[PDB]
Curated annotation (Swiss-Prot), chains A, B:
Name recorded for this polypeptide: GTPase HRas
Mutagenesis / variant outcome for changing T121I: GTP-binding activity reduced by factor of 25
Catalytic reaction(s) noted: GTP + H2O = GDP + phosphate + H(+)
This protein's GO CC annotations: ciliary basal body; cytoplasm; cytosol; endoplasmic reticulum membrane; glutamatergic synapse; Golgi apparatus; Golgi membrane; GTPase complex
Pfam annotation, one family: Ras
Gene source species: Homo sapiens (Human)
Name of the encoding gene: HRAS
Phenotype for C100S: Abolishes S-nitrosylation. No stimulation of guanine nucleotide exchange
Length: 141, 141
């Protein structure tokens, strides 16, 4: 069957609410069998420092986060996109607005103007599949 | 604020579960105030016979259904697309798979190959915003 490659930008893991739940805790692959929009097995990073050339996990994926309070994390976006574009392609199937149930955010929705490149998720309520089912882009790429 | 124009293909109305609920019953405009992915007011047809040049409600919309058991309704898709493309545009922001909790379907997921044009919804369970929030396409058109 169709087997989907998913490789997700300090609440990414969080998302992966696979295990239906809500989790201070190197690498996790995960495998579930859904149906999306009509038999689909799904196939989680840590963006801390150390991995940089282990990252080039950008090679084996099809579809590819910030915290709405963390502007430097908004600002980490631009370092990222570059090493998956340089999957020598200027268009990869690919923006995660996590931590949206919170009450003092430094990255304004407005500013996530995404549209230059080509969702606001709460891993704490479940406002987690609306971002992932990215599978739909895989499905037209 | 941003005011979104929405004009939806015998379970369309159904969808519009606006009123949070689940409904044998000419035209309904509807107005709700959400947030999608970061202040968004939302702005329902009957595809029976009579309206055809009243339809040309294709002029005042930005974003624009079948029943998974109804192949002739799958087959009504192609009549439709044409009069909103002829909004003299070959690319309009715009496929609804309704009646997906049921158990004998004549339109196979597989065949909704959508991808030529450019979701499977249950208005009976709530498997209703995943199709609509179409608003995201409006937002990059
Ligand atoms: N309130 C709130 N906290 C969250 C949410 N998602 C994650 N967190 C918290 O933020 C912290 C980090 O969550 P993790 O899932 O470990 O984050 P990380 O993104 O994995 O860090 P890297 O793996 O290096 O990218 C934890 O204490 C989480 O509970 C969310 O949506 N709401
Ligand atoms: N089981 C089931 N029946 C549904 C669903 N959605 C609609 N129906 C039923 O199908 C029938 C038609 O629903 P309506 O919402 O009136 O359908 P319609 O699409 O409005 O007809 P037009 O307005 O001419 O396009 C009703 O008896 C609904 O309850 C659904 O997802 N599940
Ligand atoms: Mg993580
Ligand atoms: Mg209807």
């Amino acid at each position: 069957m169709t087997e989907y490659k998913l490789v997700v930008g300090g609440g990414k893991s969080a998302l992966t609410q696979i295990q239906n739940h809500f989790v201070y805790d190197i690498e996790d692959s995960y495998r579930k069998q859904v149906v999306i929009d009509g038999t689909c097995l799904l196939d989680d990073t840590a963006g801390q420092e150390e991995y940089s050339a282990m990252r080039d996990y950008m090679r084996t994926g099809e579809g590819f986060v910030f915290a709405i309070n963390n502007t430097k994390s908004f600002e980490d976006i631009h370092q990222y996109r570059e090493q998956i574009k340089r999957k020598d392609s200027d268009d990869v199937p690919m923006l995660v607005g996590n931590k949206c149930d919170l009450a003092g955010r430094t990255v304004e929705s407005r500013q996530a103007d995404a549209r230059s490149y080509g969702i606001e998720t709460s891993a704490k309520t479940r406002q987690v599949e609306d971002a992932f089912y990215l599978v739909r882009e895989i499905r037209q790429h």
